[PDB]
Symmetry: C2
Amino acid sequence: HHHHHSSGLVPRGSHMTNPAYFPQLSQLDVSGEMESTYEDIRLTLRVPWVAFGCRVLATFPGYLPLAWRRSAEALITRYAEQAADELRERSLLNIGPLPNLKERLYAAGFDDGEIEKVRRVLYAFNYGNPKYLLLITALSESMQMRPVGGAEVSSELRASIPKGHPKGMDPLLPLVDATKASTEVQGLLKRVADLHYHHGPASDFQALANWPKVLQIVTDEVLAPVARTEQYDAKSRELVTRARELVRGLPGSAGVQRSELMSMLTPNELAGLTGVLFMYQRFIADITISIIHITECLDGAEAASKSPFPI
Amino acid sequence: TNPAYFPQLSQLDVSGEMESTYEDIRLTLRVPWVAFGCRVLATFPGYLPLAWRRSAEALITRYAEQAADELRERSLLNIGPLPNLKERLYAAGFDDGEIEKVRRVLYAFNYGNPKYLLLITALSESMQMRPVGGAEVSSELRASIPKGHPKGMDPLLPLVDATKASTEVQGLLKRVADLHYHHGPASDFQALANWPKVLQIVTDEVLAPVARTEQYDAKSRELVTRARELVRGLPGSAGVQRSELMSMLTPNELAGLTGVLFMYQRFIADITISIIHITECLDGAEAASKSPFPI
């Protein structure tokens, strides 16, 4: 079975030649227990998307439904929320002074109502991005036979937060499919991915690609002078490391150890899975920073770094 | 299933075209081991033989040799005054002959490690559909180097196999892997595992206050980033673009392979620094940074 059903107007397989496409199971394409998992990830994390990293993990037989089932309880703790809160706050780059991005979007105009639509998207991602960095870290760390959780934590941080989505947030954010997209947009997504030296475009960039000119401006004018700079790389290393410590201190258990997946996955798959998790620690960290940076250029440091959706 | 072991295809088990690939890698790079990175890359159907074929001629050029030379020199950490590892090994019951055996292994690795970084970086970048090679290169630097192993160098190093090892060896290899936050131990450490005491001294006394420090991490990003730039300047072709692999590998193997290559870029930069650092404590900055097998 193939999931990509392009028409007779292109050859079968064409989408894989698309540099802005990366192999993944999409939110639309997913069915069965995987579809249930996807929905559960979104309600449990209070986010309107399934992370690119999860969608790639979804392509490994059996893994993600099990991996999520073992991490879900831990990721609804006040601890996990506070942990994502800290990582979100640490994401700020000490750069100054910043492009006034709002006046810039006016100049591209863009009125207040349209900039609010960009902002809504930026905020949903600011909220979930650090949360996903913890999940992927709990998963990567246990995949590599290092301890995840089991820590001694007060009742208050063990308490859980409610499942569902907060008032200011639509349940499911529309992402541009790079395979149904124009040359211009494929170009835009591939350029921002290459800018970060990434394997593909983050869901973040799929979502802003709804306004191709917004994505262009934030890529070439906002992110180009900052991405992959010393200070940027240093900040990413700090998030990767901090998230690593945060998952050690988790109450309960998260992730699934590589020894326990011997019955489930082939050696090759376990090697690819290990490499995929490694990569997504850094990818999410990078993206966590880039989008908070854009947000800061728009609204400032407090709006950027505080939880957009308190919870 | 024990944590010191990671999925790979060993130099011993390899057979068919894959065995021929391994031997040619050893002959072409002039190194006594096929990298852990490569041994794991060999678990994906058809990839490594193909990937090597299309990179071997880029990787035997004088440009590539001089590129590896640079990356090796860039590897020194400026950390301050060092443990005298020669006098520490004497203190631990080693004589001159045994330190010479350890030296020979350190120098072999110092030599090969940055070459493997260039190879895996080329594989990584081309897998991520970003340009590799095709630069303007002087006739002098497109000139290949002689194939085969130099003198002062074993044609194949003994590497301890973690799956068969004592609790002691299994523990030491995990500890050093965890120190660097690695998914499994380097061959470097499998080779030093032949002298368990050496592996422990180097892990606990030398690398323990150095690995994963801010300085180390910055040096590791330096090499990853430099290797990248050097690979762009390669003569002729290298690697295999993701586009050329779709009729061979599944979507999941492509994603797994992307992620595996991205990880080994950082792994080999790390180990290059760590082992070169160990070597500096033995013999000084000059013996550690410079090519042990100049050609």
